[PDB]
Amino acid sequence: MVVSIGVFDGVHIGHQKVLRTMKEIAFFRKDDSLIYTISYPPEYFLPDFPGLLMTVESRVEMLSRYARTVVLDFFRIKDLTPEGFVERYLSGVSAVVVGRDFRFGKNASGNASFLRKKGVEVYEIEDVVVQGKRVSSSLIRNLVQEGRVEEIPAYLGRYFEIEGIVHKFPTANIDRGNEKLVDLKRGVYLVRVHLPDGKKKFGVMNVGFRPTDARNVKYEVYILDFEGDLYGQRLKLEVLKFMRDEKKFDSIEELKAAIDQDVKSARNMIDDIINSK
């Protein structure tokens, strides 16, 4: 099979390059296509990891739009020798498509080189470069932490997204799940809210330390022109623009005022977008 192998956290434009190339290679080699997505990169378990751009589930759903997608369980492959990885995951595979410096097996002893020696052809995909920077999940995770959401589409191929369930003064508190995900810079954001039933609304989302565990961040959105409790429902939010830093108000009024100011600003932004016919 022609098999793409990588993490693909975020499925950014560099990943899309790998996947499109795999499909073309599959077409001319007349082989089938398969994407192996490693559940977590090794850095994920280290203390300073910023967090994934999205859950593995969201990721697989996106990868699946390109080809059959199989998750490689980090815990199941980290200890394998290069030999055992090939024997167990690449039997009958004649070609793999991976990014440069791809590594595998315990102590990262496996590489494209080793694969070629086992008769596998390896197509190493060069990184995609955007405005002088190499597109990578790390770069995108850093933009999220710096709240630089308008610059994200040029690297990710779309706006950064926050996703989760509600709950678990009307705002929807988004539970993003139990996976370690990158957090947006604390503050207020203009968001496009994809509700269930296909409706799309705009929202003003606040991101703030709500300690209650420490690097614990809360995501609550005030959806514009929408009532009805989405409590228990799944939401997806495109993070469009950083509006203002988080603030420490001195009691239920200047907050209200600040919020009112956020919505007002949002309304103006939306109206600007609309007028850009």
Ligand X SMILES: Cc1cc2nc3[nH]c(=O)[nH]c(=O)c3nc2cc1C
Give DSSP secondary structure letters for 91-143: TT--EEEEETT--BSGGG-B-HHHHHHTT-EEEEEPPPEETTEE--HHHHHHH
Q: Which is nearer to Mg ion, 98 or 240 (CB)?
A: 98
**Which window, 99-107, 146-154, 159-167, 257-265, contacts ligand X (CB under 6 A)?**
257-265
Total residues at the site for Mg ion (CB under 5 A)?
Answer: 2
Query: What minimum distance in Å lies between the beta carbon of 214 and ligand X?
Result: 16
Q: Which is nearer to ligand X, 48 or 213 (CB)?
A: 213
Tally of CB atoms within 10 A around 186: 16
Contacts to ligand X from residues 162-191, by CB under 6 A: 171, 188
How far is Cα 98 from Cα 125, in angstroms, rounded to an integer? 6
135 is in an annotated binding site: yes
244 is in an annotated binding site: yes
Scored b (16 or more CB within 10 A) or e, 212-227 reads eeeeebbbbbbbbeee
Q: Which is nearer to ligand X, 86 or 204 (CB)?
A: 204
User: Among residues 219, 220, 238, 242, which is the contact residue for ligand X, using CB under 6 A?
Assistant: 220
φ/ψ of residue 273, rounded to 5: -60, -50
Query: How many Cα atoms are found within 13 Å in the side-chain-facing hemisphere of 220?
Result: 13
* Best CA proximity match to 188, nearest among 252, 240, 122: 240
Query: Binding string to Mg ion for residues 101 to 120, with x set by CB under 5 A, is what?
Result: ------------------x-
Residues that bind Mg ion (CB under 5 A): 94, 119
Residues that bind ligand X (CB under 6 A): 171, 188, 204, 206, 208, 220, 222, 246-247, 258-259, 262
Annotated binding site for riboflavin: 220, 244, 247
